[PDB]
Design a binder for these strands. Sequence first.
DNA 1: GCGATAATTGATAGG
DNA 2: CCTATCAATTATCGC
Length: 57
Amino acid sequence: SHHHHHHSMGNSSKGVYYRNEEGQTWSGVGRQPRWLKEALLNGMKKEDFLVKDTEEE
DNA sequence: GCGATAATTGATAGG
DNA sequence: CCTATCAATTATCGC
């Protein structure tokens, strides 16, 4: 069984955004910032750094 | 530091 | 596949 945090959860109707080491955040709508592309090719899925208004760090 | 305006970056539309 | 237009993000100016 996949017993981990996964930082995904079931949330969408809230302040959902992507946050990387740069501290920059993406709303998830429209188009992603230049760092999203970099983080994606960095070897990690964008979902791996998906933080919402809830369960936020 | 927060708010608005301008430039760059990403996706969608047209050829 | 390449060029143009619209939408979001990042940076600069104003408060």
